[PDB]
Ligand binder design. Structure first.
Ligand SMILES: Nc1ncnc2c1ncn2[C@@H]1O[C@H](COP(=O)(O)OP(=O)(O)OP(=O)(O)O)C[C@H]1O
Ligand SMILES: [Mg+2]
Ligand SMILES: [Zn+2]
Ligand SMILES: [Zn+2]
Lengths: 103, 50, 199, 197, 65, 49, 343, 148, 348
RNA sequence: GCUCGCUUCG
C-alpha cells in the first residue's frame, strides 16, 4: 500500500510508469532520481510532490525502448542500497582508524 | 438598516462561512480549499436516488 | 523636512482614496439601481421591464464586449490569418495569386451560411482579403514570381504563401467567432454596464 | 496556548504585514555553510513597490550586531551608518552585503543567486485564524425578521449585500439568487385570500 | 518570560548557558567575548542569548509566595 | 498598536476580558533611542528571527 | 579551451560577483559526448573516500569525496529528521503552583533531550496511553521551594533566601518500569546536559509531575532531532590565475580568511599562496578590490563535501551517521520488498 | 546528403550592442564564397569564439550522412557514425521564418531565413539561390567547426 | 430521503470578497477539503478578488439546490469568466513570482541538462496531468554538451503531451522592445510562439500578465477553449515556483546601493539644477522674467522650477539604470513588470 | 435579546 504503480493511460503501456510512494519526502525521491538517472535506458526520470499537506511523492519513469520501467526502478533501488552499504563500511572503517591513530 | 435595504435587497443567509485566506499554488484556478472544520458544519441536502 | 513632505503626500493619497471609496460606492449603487431593469431579448432588441425598447440592437452591431478580441473590434484579421497559416500549413498545395485568392474568396463567401452574417463584417473580410491580395501581388512583382507555378526558386513561394485550404479555414474560423461573439439573449446587459462603469 | 499555523498574521516592524502561507519542515529549508536555516522566508517582490530600504538596513544592522554582540541604533534621521555595519560584517568573515552562499535544501544543489539572510524583529499580531474562522449552520434567527443574526459571538451568518445581489444579477443566475435570498434566508408560507387580497 | 531551552533556528541547547552567561556579565566579560567563550559560533545562538530579557524574576516579585 | 507581547510585571494577577501574551519575548537588536526612553526593551512585543 | 571549460563546468562550481554558475549536477550519460557518465560501481568504490578531520564529544567533521549532492542532501535530511530518539511527550501534573504555565512547562520539558539509547526501545502503537516497559520511560520531577531556615538578615540574593528556587533538569529522577532497572545500569538514563533551567520558583510554590517519553522521529516534531546542526559544504579551492606578489599580496591575506592565504619571502619579496582553502568561508571580499578581481578564481569542488555534525548529546555523532545510513537502507529495503510483493 | 547549406564564414563583430548575456553572444559573420550575412546566437561558455575566428557552418536537414531522415526522436546515448562527428558545435532548430528583403524596392533577389534554436536566433540573409530547400516549419541541424 | 451530507470534493461553492466592485468579485469554484483552517485558492485568481493575503477575510457560500449549483458552475465558473465584461481583457493571469519566474526561465542565459529539465517538467505532472506522456523535447545544443533551453521547458507547459491538440501561435512586442529589431531585438523582447513552442522572446507582464490583450492565456482561451487555458495556467503555477526556488531569487542592500559614477552624475545634476533655479529666482525677483503663455510670472517660475527638478530626477534615474548591472533583483522585477517600475528604482 | 458609542480588521 506504500508504493503503487500507474500506467500512462488505459492502454497499459509499460514504457511510461508512475510510482506513487507514501510517507516519503524529497530525500528518497532525490536519491532514487540520481541513482536511476544514470541508467542509459531511461529517457525521462522525474519526482514531484502532490501537496505539502500529505506525505506522498510521485515518480515518473519513461524508458527508451521496450523496457517495462519497473526493472530500472529495482535497478536504481539496488544500486542505492549498495552505495549506502559501501559508504557505511567506509565511514565505519574511517572512524575506527581515526580512533586507533588518536590513542 | 431599513426593510428594503437591510432586509429585502440585502439579507443575511445561513449555510455560509467566513475565513482568512492563504496562498496555495498547487490547486487549480477553478478549485478552492475548504478547512475540515467548516466542511463538517456546512451541509448539503442530497436526495437518495438509484 | 523631506520626510515631512513625503508624509504629507502619503496622507493626501490616503484621504483621497478614503473619499473615493464612499463616492464610487454611492455612484455604483445609483447606477446599478437605475440600470438593473434592462435585458437582451431574443429578437436582438434590448427592452426595459415594461416592454419599452431602449435599443433596436445592442451597441449598433450586437457583439459581446466580453468576447471582444480586438480594440473594440470582433476579430484581428492579421492574427487570425497567421494562426490559420501556422496551425494548418499545407505543403502539398501550391500558393495562390491575387486573382485566384479573390476568386476563391468570392466563391466561398456566397454560400448559405454566410448570408445570415452581418454585412459590415463581410465588407471588412473583403477589405482584408483585398489588402492581403495586394500585398501578395506586390511581393510577386518585387521578386518576379510567376502565377503559373514554374518558378525555379521555390523558396520565393514561401514569402507570402497561401492555399485555398487555409483560406477556407480562415473564413470558417472568422464566421464561427463572429457568430459566437454575439449577445446571447437573456443576458442582464444593464447590470454589466453599470458594473463596468462603476468599477 | 496557541502555536503559529496557517492564517496567523505576522508583522515585521516595517508595515509588511503578512499571513503564514506554508509551514515547511526544517530539512526543506535552505541552509548556509554554517548550517543555519531561516525561520521566516519573505517575498522580495514586496520591496520594489513599497521601497522599504529601511528593512534591509535594519536587517544588516541586526546581523552586524548579533555578530559583534552589540545593539545598533535605528534612530530617525541618524543611527548607525551602512559603512560601519559593512565593516563589522567584513571583520567577522561574513559578506559585506548580507548575501551569503546558500545551498538548496530540497535538491541539495547550491543556488545560482545569493540569499539575503539576517535577524529581523518580527512581531505577531492579535489577528488569528482560529478566532476569525466562522461557519454557520441553520442556527437561530431574529425575532423581528426571521433571518440569521449578525455577529460571530451571536453565531450569525454572512450577509449577501446589495452589491452581491448586483453581481448575481449581472451573472444572470436567477435560480441561485432566488435560493440564496428567499429559500435559504427567510422562506415562509403565508395564506392569501384571492377575494380581498 | 524565561530563557527558551532550544534555539529557534538551529536547535542548540541554550537554556543551560543562561545563568553562566549572567555570571560572565557579573564578571568583567563583555557581550561578544562572553558569547564566544560560551561556545556560540553561529549568530543565531548569540541573538537568542543577547536579545533575551529575563522577566521571570519580575513576575516572581508579583507571585503569591 | 495591535502588536502582541507582555503588558507589565503584574500581567499574571491582572484579569481582563482579553489578553495576549508572548511565550518568549525578545528585545529588538536594532532599537531606537525612543525605545530606550519609553523602556520598551523591558517589555518587548516580538521576537527576532 | 573548450575541454577546459567543459571540465570546469562538470567538476567545479564557480562563484561570480553577482551570481553562482555551474551549480547543477550534470555528470549523466548522454549529457556529455566525450565522457561516459554511465553508472559504474567499481569507479565509485575506487574514487569514494571518507576522511575525518575532527571528532570530539557531540561534534564531528568529515570530508566525503566521490559522493554526489543528492546523496549528501539525503544523508543530511535523514540526520535532521529521520533519526529516531527519545523525548518527553506526556506530562502528568499534580498541583503545579508555579508561575510558569502548565502548557509552557510541558513544552519546555519536551525540548529537554534524553540520554537514553533509542535503538533499545520501540515505537508506541496507536493509542495505548498507559505505555509499556518496552516503549516508554518515566521521569519524576518533584520540587518544593521553601525559605532557607538559616540565612543572613538581609539576604538580598535569592540563593541565600530560598532553596530549590531554580528547578534544574538535574532534579529529574528516572523511575524504572518492569525490568528496565536491570537492563539499564544506574546513571545511563538521565538528562543530557543536567544544567538546563526549567523554571524558577518561590517559597510556597511546588512543581510535581511525571513525564512519559516515547520513541519518535524529528519529522513529527523537532524535539526528537538528535543533531543540533548537521550540515555539509562544498570544499573550496582558491586558485591564482597570475602570480600575485608585493604589498597587494598582503591584501589577499586581508581579503580572504586569515588562515587560507599565506605570504612568503622566497626572494625577499612577499608573495601570496593558498595554504589551507578549507578554512575559507567565501566572504567574497576580493570583489571589492578592483585590481584583484581578475587575478583570483573562487570555486567549489563538486564531489567533495565537508560534513559538520554537532549533536545535542544523546549519542555520539558517528553512531548518528551510521543510524542515518541504516535508516536509508531500511527505506530502500522496504520499497524493494513492496515492489517484490507487487510482482 | 541532406546538406541544405554549407559555407565558410568570418566573424566581423562579437557584440555590437554590448555584453547583454553572459553565456550567449550575437555573432555577425560574412561569407567568402558568397555575400551571405549571418546573425547567429552562439554559446561562448561551451564553445568560445573570437573576433578574427573563421569557421565552416553547415545547415543540414538530417544529422545522418547516409540520407536517413528518420528523426522522430534523438537519443544522445546512441553511438553511430553521424555528421556531428566531423564538427564541433552542433545545434538543433527549426526554420520559423522566411522573409524577403525590403531594402530593395524593385528587382530584389535577397531573402532571409530566421531559425530559432530554442530561442537562439539565426538570420541567414543572401541570394535566394543559396537558400534553396529552406521551408517554414522544417527542423534542421546546424554544425559549426572552427578552422585554423 | 434527504441526507445532509458534509461538504465533500467536487461540490460547487460560491467564494466571494465582501467588497465587490465588479461581478468577478464572486465566483463559483470546486471545493477540495484540506486539514488546515484557511480558504486556499490559486493566486492567479487574486486579481479579480483584489486580494493581497494580508489578513483578508472572504466569504464562502454553499447552495442548497441542484439548479442553483448548476447555474453557479456554468455561469460563474472560473474557467468561463477569465475575461472581464468591461473591455474583454483577461483578469485571471500570471501574477508576481510567476512573471519573474517565467521571465528568468525564458531568459537566453538558461541552459538545463537532462536531469534538471526532467525535474522541472515533472514538477507539473500531478492531478489530471498524471495520465499524459511527458514528451521530452529534443535538446538544442547536443555535441559539446546536451543542454535544454528554458524556452523549450516553458513551451512544454503549452503542449505537454503528444495527443494534446493545443497549437499556440502569438507574435507581439515586449516591454523592453527596442522598436527596430523586428524579432531581432538586442534585448530579445519580441515574443514569437509557433505551434505551442516559444520560438523567440522572453515572457513578461505584457504576455503573461493580466494587463491587456495579446496574452498567451487569452489566445489559448479564444482559440482552444477554457479547459486548455486552465490547464496551461495550472502547469505554469506548478512549474514557475519550483524553478524559482531551485534557482534562487533574493534582494539585498547591495542591490539598491548607488555607484560612484551615479553619485558624481547626481551631484553634477543637483548643482546645475540649483544654479538654474537660483538664476530663475534672481530673474523673477530682480528684473523681468519671461512669462509663459496662459499663466502669471509666479506660475511660470513654479513651472520652470518643477521642470528643472524633473530634469534632475529623470537624469539621475537614467544614470542609475545605466550604471546598474544585470541580474539585479529590483531591475529584473521591473523589466518583467511583475512588481515595481523604473521610477520606484530611481526613487529608492 | 433591542439600541447606541468606541475600537479594529481588508
Ligand atoms: N473602506 C474600504 N472599502 C472597500 N475596500 C477596502 C476598504 N478598506 C480596505 N479595503 C480593501 O483593502 C484593499 C486596499 O489596499 P490598497 O489600498 O490597494 O493597499 P494599501 O493599503 O495602500 O497598502 P500599501 O500602503 O500600498 O502597502 C482593497 C480593498 O478590497
Ligand atoms: Mg488585504
Ligand atoms: Zn378575504
Ligand atoms: Zn542557535
Amino acid at each position: 500500500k506504500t508504493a503503487l504503480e500507474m500506467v500512462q493511460a488505459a492502454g497499459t503501456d509499460r514504457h511510461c510508469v508512475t510510482f506513487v510512494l507514501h510517507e516519503e519526502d524529497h530525500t528518497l525521491g532525490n536519491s532514487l532520481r540520481y541513482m536511476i538517472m544514470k541508467n542509459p535506458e531511461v529517457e525521462f526520470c522525474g519526482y514531484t510532490t502532490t501537496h505539502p499537506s500529505e506525505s506522498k511523492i510521485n515518480l515518473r519513469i519513461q524508458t527508451r525502448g521496450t523496457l517495462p520501467a519497473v526493472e530500472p526502478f529495482q535497478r536504481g533501488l539496488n544500486e542505492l542500497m549498495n552505495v549506502c552499504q559501501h559508504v557505511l563500511d567506509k565511514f565505519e572503517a574511517s572512524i575506527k582508524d581515526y580512533k586507533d591513530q588518536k590513542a | 438598516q431599513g426593510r428594503f435595504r437591510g432586509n429585502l435587497s440585502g439579507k443575511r443567509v445561513d449555510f455560509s462561512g467566513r475565513t482568512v485566506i492563504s496562498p496555495d499554488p498547487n490547486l487549480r484556478i477553478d478549485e478552492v480549499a475548504v478547512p475540515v472544520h467548516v466542511a463538517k458544519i456546512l451541509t448539503f441536502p442530497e436526495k437518495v436516488n438509484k | 523636512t523631506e520626510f515631512f513632505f513625503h508624509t504629507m503626500a502619503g496622507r493626501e493619497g490616503l484621504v483621497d482614496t478614503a473619499v473615493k471609496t464612499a463616492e464610487t460606492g454611492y455612484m455604483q449603487r445609483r447606477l446599478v439601481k437605475s440600470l438593473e431593469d434592462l435585458c437582451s431579448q431574443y429578437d436582438l432588441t434590448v427592452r426595459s421591464s415594461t416592454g419599452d425598447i431602449i435599443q433596436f440592437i445592442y451597441g449598433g452591431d450586437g457583439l459581446d464586449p466580453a468576447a471582444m478580441e480586438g480594440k473594440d473590434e470582433p476579430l484581428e484579421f492579421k492574427r487570425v490569418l497567421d494562426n490559420i497559416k501556422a496551425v494548418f500549413p499545407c505543403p502539398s498545395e501550391p500558393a495562390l495569386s491575387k486573382n485566384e485568392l479573390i476568386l476563391t474568396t468570392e466563391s466561398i463567401m456566397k454560400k448559405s451560411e454566410f448570408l445570415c452574417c452581418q454585412d459590415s463584417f463581410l465588407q471588412e473580410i473583403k477589405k482584408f482579403i483585398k489588402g492581403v491580395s495586394e500585398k501578395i501581388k506586390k511581393t510577386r512583382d518585387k521578386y518576379g514570381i510567376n502565377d503559373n507555378g514554374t518558378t525555379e526558386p521555390r523558396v520565393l513561394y514561401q514569402l507570402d504563401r497561401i492555399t485555398p485550404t487555409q483560406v477556407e479555414k480562415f473564413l470558417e474560423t472568422c464566421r464561427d467567432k463572429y457568430m459566437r461573439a454575439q449577445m446571447e439573449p437573456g443576458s442582464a446587459v444593464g447590470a454589466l454596464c453599470a458594473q463596468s462603469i462603476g468599477e | 496556548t496557541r502555536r503559529p499555523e496557517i492564517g496567523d498574521k505576522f508583522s515585521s516592524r516595517h508595515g509588511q504585514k503578512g499571513v503564514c502561507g506554508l509551514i515547511v519542515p526544517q530539512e526543506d529549508m535552505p541552509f548556509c555553510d554554517s548550517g543555519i536555516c531561516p525561520d521566516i522566508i519573505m517575498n522580495p517582490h514586496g520591496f520594489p513597490s513599497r521601497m522599504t530600504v529601511g528593512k534591509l538596513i535594519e536587517l544588516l544592522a541586526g546581523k552586524a550586531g548579533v555578530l559583534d554582540g552589540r545593539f545598533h541604533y535605528g534612530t530617525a534621521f541618524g543611527g548607525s551608518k551602512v559603512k560601519d555595519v559593512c565593516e563589522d560584517l567584513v571583520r567577522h568573515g561574513y559578506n559585506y552585503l548580507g548575501k551569503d552562499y546558500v545551498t538548496s535544501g530540497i535538491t541539495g544543489e547550491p543556488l545560482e543567486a545569493y540569499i539575503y539572510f539576517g535577524p529581523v524583529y518580527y512581531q505577531k499580531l492579535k489577528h488569528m485564524v482560529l478566532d476569525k474562522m466562522h461557519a454557520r449552520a441553520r442556527g437561530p434567527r431574529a425575532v423581528l425578521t426571521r433571518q440569521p443574526t449578525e455577529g460571530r459571538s451571536r453565531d450569525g451568518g454572512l450577509r449577501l449585500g446589495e452589491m452581491e445581489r448586483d453581481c448575481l444579477i449581472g451573472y444572470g443566475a436567477s435560480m441561485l439568487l432566488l435560493e440564496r435570498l428567499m429559500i435559504s434566508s427567510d422562506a415562509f408560507e403565508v395564506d392569501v385570500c384571492g377575494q380581498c387580497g | 518570560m524565561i530563557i527558551p531551552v532550544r534555539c529557534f533556528t538551529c536547535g542548540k541547547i541554550v537554556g543551560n548557558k543562561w545563568e553562566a552567561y549572567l555570571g560572565l556579565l557579573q564578571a568583567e566579560y563583555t557581550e561578544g567575548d562572553a558569547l564566544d567563550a560560551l561556545g556560540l559560533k553561529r549568530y543565531c545562538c548569540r541573538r537568542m542569548l543577547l536579545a533575551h530579557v529575563d522577566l521571570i524574576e519580575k513576575l516572581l516579585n508579583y507571585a503569591p509566595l | 498598536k495591535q502588536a502582541m507581547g507582555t503588558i507589565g510585571y503584574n500581567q499574571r494577577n491582572r484579569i481582563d476580558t482579553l489578553m495576549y501574551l508572548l511565550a518568549y519575548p525578545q528585545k529588538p537588536m536594532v532599537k531606537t533611542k525612543t525605545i530606550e526612553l519609553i523602556e520598551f526593551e523591558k517589555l518587548p512585543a516580538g521576537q527576532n528571527a | 579551451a573548450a575541454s577546459q571549460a567543459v571540465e570546469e563546468m562538470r567538476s567545479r562550481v564557480v562563484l561570480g560577483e553577482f551570481g553562482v554558475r555551474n551549480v547543477h549536477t550534470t555528470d549523466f550519460p548522454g549529457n556529455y559526448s566525450g565522457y561516459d557518465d554511465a553508472w559504474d560501481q567499481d569507479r565509485f568504490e575506487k574514487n569514494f573516500r571518507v576522511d575525518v578531520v575532527h571528532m570530539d564529544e557531540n561534534s564531528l567533521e568529515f570530508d566525503m569525496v566521490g559522493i554526489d549532492a543528492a546523496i549528501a542532501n539525503a544523508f543530511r535530511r535523514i540526520l535532521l529528521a529521520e533519526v529516531p530518539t527519545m523525548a518527553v511527550e506526556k506530562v502528568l501534573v499534580y498541583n503545579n503552583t508555579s508561575i510558569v504555565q502548565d502548557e509552557i512547562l510541558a513544552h519546555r520539558l519536551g525540548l529537554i533531550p534524553i540520554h537514553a539509547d533509542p535503538r533499545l526501545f520501540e515505537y508506541r502503537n496507536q493509542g495505548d496511553e498507559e505505555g509499556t516497559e518496552i516503549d516508554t520511560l518515566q521521569f519524576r520531577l518533584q520540587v518544593r521551594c521553601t525559605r532557607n531556615p538559616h540565612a543572613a538578615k538581609d539576604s538580598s540574593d535569592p540563593n541565600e533566601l530560598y532553596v530549590n528556587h531554580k528547578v534544574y533538569t538535574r532534579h529529574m529522577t528516572w523511575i524504572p518500569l518492569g525490568n528496565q532497572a536491570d537492563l539499564f545500569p544506574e546513571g545511563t538514563i538521565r538528562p543530557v546536559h543536567d544544567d538546563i533551567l526549567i523554571a524558577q520558583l518561590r517559597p510556597g510554590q511546588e512543581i510535581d509531575l511525571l513525564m512519559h517519553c516515547v520513541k519518535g522521529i524529528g519529522k513529527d516534531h523537532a524535539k526528537f532531532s538528535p543533531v543540533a546542526t548537521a550540515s555539509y559544504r562544498l570544499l573550496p579551492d582558491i586558485t591564482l590565475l597570475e602570480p600575485v606578489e608585493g604589498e597587494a599580496a598582503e591584501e589577499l591575506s586581508r581579503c580572504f580568511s586569515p588562515g587560507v592565504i599565506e605570504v612568503q619571502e622566497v626572494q625577499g619579496k612577499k608573495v601570496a599562496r593558498v595554504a589551507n582553502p578549507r578554512l575559507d568561508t567565501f566572504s567574497r571580499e576580493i570583489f571589492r578590490n578592483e585590481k584583484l578581481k581578475k587575478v583570483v578564481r573562487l570555486a567549489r569542488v563538486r564531489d567533495h563535501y565537508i560534513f559538520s555534525v554537532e549533536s545535542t548529546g544523546v549519542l555520539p555523532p558517528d553512531v548518528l551517521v551510521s543510524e542515518a545510513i541504516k535508516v536509508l537502507m531500511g527505506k530502500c529495503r522496504r520499497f524493494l520488498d513492496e515492489l517484490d510483493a507487487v510482482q | 546528403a541532406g546538406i541544405l547549406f554549407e559555407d565558410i564564414f568570418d566573424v566581423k563583430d562579437i557584440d555590437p550592442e554590448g555584453k547583454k548575456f553572459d553565456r550567449v553572444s550575437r555573432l555577425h559573420c560574412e561569407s567568402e564564397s558568397f555575400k551571405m550575412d549571418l546573425i547567429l546566437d552562439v554559446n561562448i561558455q561551451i564553445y568560445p569564439v573570437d573576433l578574427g575566428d573563421k569557421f565552416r557552418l553547415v545547415i543540414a536537414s538530417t544529422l545522418y550522412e547516409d540520407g536517413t531522415l528518420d528523426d522522430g526522436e534523438y537519443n544522445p546515448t546512441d553511438d553511430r557514425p553521424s555528421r556531428a562527428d566531423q564538427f564541433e558545435y552542433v545545434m538543433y532548430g527549426k526554420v520559423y521564418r522566411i522573409e524577403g528583403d525590403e531594402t530593395s524596392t524593385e528587382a530584389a533577389t535577397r531573402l532571409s531565413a530566421y531559425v530559432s534554436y530554442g530561442g537562439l536566433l539565426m538570420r541567414l540573409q543572401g541570394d535566394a539561390n543559396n537558400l534553396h530547400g529552406f521551408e517554414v516549419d522544417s527542423r534542421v541541424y546546424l554544425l559549426m567547426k572552427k578552422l585554423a | 430521503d434527504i441526507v445532509e451530507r458534509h461538504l465533500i470534493d467536487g461540490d460547487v461553492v460560491l467564494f466571494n470578497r465582501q467588497p465587490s466592485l465588479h461581478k468577478l468579485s464572486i465566483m463559483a469554484h470546486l471545493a477540495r477539503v484540506k486539514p488546515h483552517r484557511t480558504f486556499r485558492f490559486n493566486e492567479c485568481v487574486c486579481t479579480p478578488y483584489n486580494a493581497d493575503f494580508d489578513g483578508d477575510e472572504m466569504n464562502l457560500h454553499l447552495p442548497q439546490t441542484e439548479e442553483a449549483k448548476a447555474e453557479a458552475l456554468v455561469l460563474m465558473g472560473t474557467k468561463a469568466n477569465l475575461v472581464t465584461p468591461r473591455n474583454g481583457e483577461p483578469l485571471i493571469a500570471a501574477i508576481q513570482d510567476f512573471l519573474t519566474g517565467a521571465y528568468l526561465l525564458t531568459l537566453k542565459d538558461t541552459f538545463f541538462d537532462r536531469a534538471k529539465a526532467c525535474q522541472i517538467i515533472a514538477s507539473i505532472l500531478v492531478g489530471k496531468d498524471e495520465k499524459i506522456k511527458v514528451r521530452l523535447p529534443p535538446p538544442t545544443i547536443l555535441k559539446p554538451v546536451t543542454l535544454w533551453t528554458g524556452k523549450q521547458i516553458f513551451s512544454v507547459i503549452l503542449r505537454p503531451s503528444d495527443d494534446n491538440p493545443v497549437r499556440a501561435n502569438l507574435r507581439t512586442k515586449g516591454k523592453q522592445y527596442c522598436g527596430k529589431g523586428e524579432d531581432l531585438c538586442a534585448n530579445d523582447s519580441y515574443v514569437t510562439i509557433q505551434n505551442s513552442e516559444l520560438m523567440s522572446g522572453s515572457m513578461d507582464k505584457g504576455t503573461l500578465g493580466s494587463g491587456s490583450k495579446n496574452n498567451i492565456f487569452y489566445i489559448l482561451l479564444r482559440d482552444w477553449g477554457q479547459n486548455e487555458a486552465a490547464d496551461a495556467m495550472s502547469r505554469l503555477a506548478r512549474l514557475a515556483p519550483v524553478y524559482l526556488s531551485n534557482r534562487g531569487f533574493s534582494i539585498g542592500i547591495g542591490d539598491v546601493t548607488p555607484g560612484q559614477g551615479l553619485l558624481k552624475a547626481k551631484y553634477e545634476l543637483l548643482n546645475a539644477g540649483y544654479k538654474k533655479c537660483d538664476e530663475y529666482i534672481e530673474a523673477l525677483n530682480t528684473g523681468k522674467l519671461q512669462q509663459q503663455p496662459g499663466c502669471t510670472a509666479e506660475e511660470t517660475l513654479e513651472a520652470l522650477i518643477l521642470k528643472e527638478l524633473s530634469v534632475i530626477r529623470d537624469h539621475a534615474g537614467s544614470a542609475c539604470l545605466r550604471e546598474l548591472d544585470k541580474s539585479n533583483s529590483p531591475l529584473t522585477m521591473a523589466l518583467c513588470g511583475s512588481k515595481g517600475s523604473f521610477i520606484n528604482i530611481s526613487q529608492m
